[PDB]
Design an enzyme around this catalytic site. Structure first.
Site, PDB file in Angstrom:
ATOM      1  N   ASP A   1       0.578  -1.527   0.301  1.00 11.97           N
ATOM      2  CA  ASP A   1      -0.278   0.148   0.319  1.00 11.97           C
ATOM      3  C   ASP A   1       0.690   1.461   0.264  1.00 11.97           C
ATOM      4  OD1 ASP A   1      -3.200  -0.570   0.948  1.00 11.97           O
ATOM      5  OD2 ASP A   1      -2.322   0.836  -0.327  1.00 11.97           O
TER       6      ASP A   1
ATOM      7  N   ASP B   1     -13.632   2.902  14.781  1.00 15.98           N
ATOM      8  CA  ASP B   1     -14.377   2.140  15.481  1.00 15.98           C
ATOM      9  C   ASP B   1     -13.144   0.369  15.581  1.00 15.98           C
ATOM     10  OD1 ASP B   1     -16.087   3.772  16.827  1.00 15.98           O
ATOM     11  OD2 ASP B   1     -17.499   3.387  15.107  1.00 15.98           O
TER      12      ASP B   1
END
Length: 369
Positions: free
Chosen positions: A46, A333
Site C-alpha cells: 500500500d 471503530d
C-alpha cells in the site's frame, strides 16, 4: 484431492517493516509443500515503495535457488534466516554427501541476498527530490504515494521463473491498488478487500490465507494438513492441537491473520449482485468453490484486475459491506477482519503464533485478532 489456495500478505511501509523479514515470509510461502499450480502468493504494497517492489523481485529471484534446495533436502523451516539459525548436527553421519557443498553455498547465497537487500534500503533512505528511477532506467509509477495508477506484476508462476532445477514455482503477484487524491482507500482494510478481488480474477482460489508480513510458514506441510482437515463432517465447534493449531467446525464470525478459510464464505451466497461492476469478478463469485473460467482471455482479465483495484471501484458498491472485510465509521471503530455467515457447513484452519469472555479472548488469538 487438494484445492488451490491464495495466500495474502500486506505491506504498508518498508521502513517500519524490514523487507528482509517480509522476504523470509514470502520464501516460506514459495517453498510450501503443495502443488505449485494450486498455491498463489499475492503481496500488497500500500505504500507503493519502489523498495518493496525491488525487494520482492530480489526475493523472487533468490527463491529460484532456495525453493529446490529446501525441497531436495526437506529443509524446515522454509525461511532462510531461521533455518540457518537452527542447530545442525554434523556428528550424525560419517560421510559427506552433497548436502555439505549445497548447504554451504546456499548460505553463501543467502548472505549475498541480505547484502543486496541492505543495499536497496541504503538507497531508499536518501530520497531524491525528482522521484524514483528504477534499476532498468524506467521511472517508478509510485513516487507520489497518494497519486499513482494501479500496479500488478507477476513473478515466477507458469510464465516466468523456473527454479534452477527447471521446475516452475508458485506465482508471485505484486499488487498495489490505485491511489488518487480524493479517494478514501480504507488503508489496511481497503488493501485487503481489493486484494480479495484481484486474487479472484486471477488465480481464483477456493481458499484464502492471509498472513502478516512476519508470519512465516513454520511447517512446509501446513497446507497439506490444512486441506485434509478442512474438508469432512463431524460435530463439536472447536478442537485444539498440542504456536499450535486450532481448526474450528460447524451469526457472523470474523477471522484474520494466519487462517485458512474458504473463499465463498466471504460472498454471502453458496457457489442482481453488487460486488462492483466487474462481471469477471462476479463470474468467479458464482463459479465453483474456486477456478477461473476458461472463456476468459489473459489480456481481458489483466484488464479487469486493474479495474478491480481502481479508485472508486468500491463506490456505493457494498464493500466494507455486510460481508467480506468491514470498517467502523469515522474516527475508526474496531469492527474489523473478514466475515462469514450462518455458513451451513464450514470450518476453518488456523495456525496462530468470565468463562465466555475468557474463552472469547483466546478464540480471537487463534484467528489473529
Amino acid at each position: 484431492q487438494l484445492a488451490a489456495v491464495d495466500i495474502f500478505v500486506s505491506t504498508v511501509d518498508p521502513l517500519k517493516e524490514p523487507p528482509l523479514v517480509t522476504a523470509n515470509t514470502v520464501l516460506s510461502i514459495l517453498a510450501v509443500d503443495y502443488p505449485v499450480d494450486k498455491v498463489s502468493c499475492y503481496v500488497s504494497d500500500d505504500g507503493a515503495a519502489m523498495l518493496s517492489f525491488e525487494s520482492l523481485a530480489e526475493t523472487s529471484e533468490f527463491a529460484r535457488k532456495w525453493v529446490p534446495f529446501c525441497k531436495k533436502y526437506s529443509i524446515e523451516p522454509r525461511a532462510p534466516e531461521w533455518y540457518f539459525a537452527a542447530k545442525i548436527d554434523y556428528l550424525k553421519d560419517k560421510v559427506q554427501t552433497s548436502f555439505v557443498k549445497d548447504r554451504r553455498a546456499m548460505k553463501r547465497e543467502y548472505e549475498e541476498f541480505k547484502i543486496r537487500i541492505n543495499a536497496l534500503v541504503s538507497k531508499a533512505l536518501k530520497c531524491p527530490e525528482e522521484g524514483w528511477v528504477m534499476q532498468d532506467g524506467t521511472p517508478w509509477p509510485g513516487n507520489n504515494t497518494r497519486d499513482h495508477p494501479g500496479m500488478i506484476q507477476v513473478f515466477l508462476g507458469q510464465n516466468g521463473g523456473l527454479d534452477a532445477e527447471g521446475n516452475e514455482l508458485p506465482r508471485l503477484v505484486y499488487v498495489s491498488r490505485e491511489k488518487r487524491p480524493g479517494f478514501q482507500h480504507h488503508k489496511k482494510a481497503g488493501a485487503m478487500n481489493a486484494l480479495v478481488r484481484v486474487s479472484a480474477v486471477l488465480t481464483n482460489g477456493p481458499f484464502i490465507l492471509n498472513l502478516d508480513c512476519d508470519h512465516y510458514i513454520n511447517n512446509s506441510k501446513a497446507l497439506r494438513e490444512a486441506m485434509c482437515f478442512l474438508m469432512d463432517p463431524n460435530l463439536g465447534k472447536q478442537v485444539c492441537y498440542v504456536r499450535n493449531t486450532v481448526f474450528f467446525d460447524i451469526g457472523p464470525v470474523y477471522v484474520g491473520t494466519g487462517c485458512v478459510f474458504n473463499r465463498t464464505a466471504l460472498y454471502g451466497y453458496e457457489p442482481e449482485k453488487r460486488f462492483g461492476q466487474s462481471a469477471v469478478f462476479v463470474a468467479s463469485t458464482l463459479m465453483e468453490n474456486g477456478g477461473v473460467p476458461p472463456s476468459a482471455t489473459p489480456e481481458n482479465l489483466l484488464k479487469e484486475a486493474i479495474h478491480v483495484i481502481s479508485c472508486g471501484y468500491e463506490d456505493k458498491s457494498d464493500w466494507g459491506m455486510e460481508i467480506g472485510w468491514i470498517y467502523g465509521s469515522v474516527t475508526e471503530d474496531i469492527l474489523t477482519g473478514f466475515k462469514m455467515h450462518a455458513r451451513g457447513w464450514r470450518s476453518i484452519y488456523c495456525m496462530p503464533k468470565n468463562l465466555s469472555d475468557r474463552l472469547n479472548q483466546v478464540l480471537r488469538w487463534a484467528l489473529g485478532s
